[PDB]
């Protein structure tokens, strides 16, 4: 209430859910082909 | 006491010797009128970036 | 057990104590009469306050 | 009153106007401490003695 304010972060706990579901689908079914092609 | 604010009804219980109370940073946050026994906070005014 | 992740209470921790710090550190008067600004400004002429 | 026995008053209950000690000129001294003498108006106090 002094100035001091919170500011939200740009990607949000979905996404970043989003994100560890793929790389998890990825390792699991295509080993590391999937990182370098 | 001067300043600027917004005047709200507050559910304080304060006792009969007491006027007003203060915050952590040392401002006041609820007063006694000296004209109704009703007692009021104040919130400041909105403001933003 | 909950003790597991100490680091990223810690983390949290460390940056709450320095962030409450900073506001309580308003009280004090530093060799002023009084801490509130706002005080000194009503008891006391515009010659005097700065 | 005399120095060994000085004399004391307590006032409350008062409406009080202090323009006029800054219009007379009858004061050989008039210094005030803590206080800025022109604001005295625009205050209260719990006692004055
Ligand atoms: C016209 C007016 O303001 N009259 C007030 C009254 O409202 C108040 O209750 C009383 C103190 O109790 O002082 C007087």
Known sequence: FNGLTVLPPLLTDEMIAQYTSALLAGTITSGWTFGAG | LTG?????????????????????????????????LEILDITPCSFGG | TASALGKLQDVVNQNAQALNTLVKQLSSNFGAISSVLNDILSRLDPPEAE | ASVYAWN?????????????????????????????????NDLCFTNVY
């Open chain 2, 4 to 36: 600027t604010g917004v005047l709200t009804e507050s559910n304080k219980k304060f006792l009969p010797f007491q006027q007003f109370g203060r915050d952590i940073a040392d401002t006041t946050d609820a007063v006694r009128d000296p004209q109704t």
């Open chain 4, 8 to 40: 004391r008053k307590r006032i409350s209950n008062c409406v009080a106007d202090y323009s006029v000690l800054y219009n007379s000129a009858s004061f050989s001294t008039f210094k005030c401490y803590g206080v800025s003498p022109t604001k005295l």
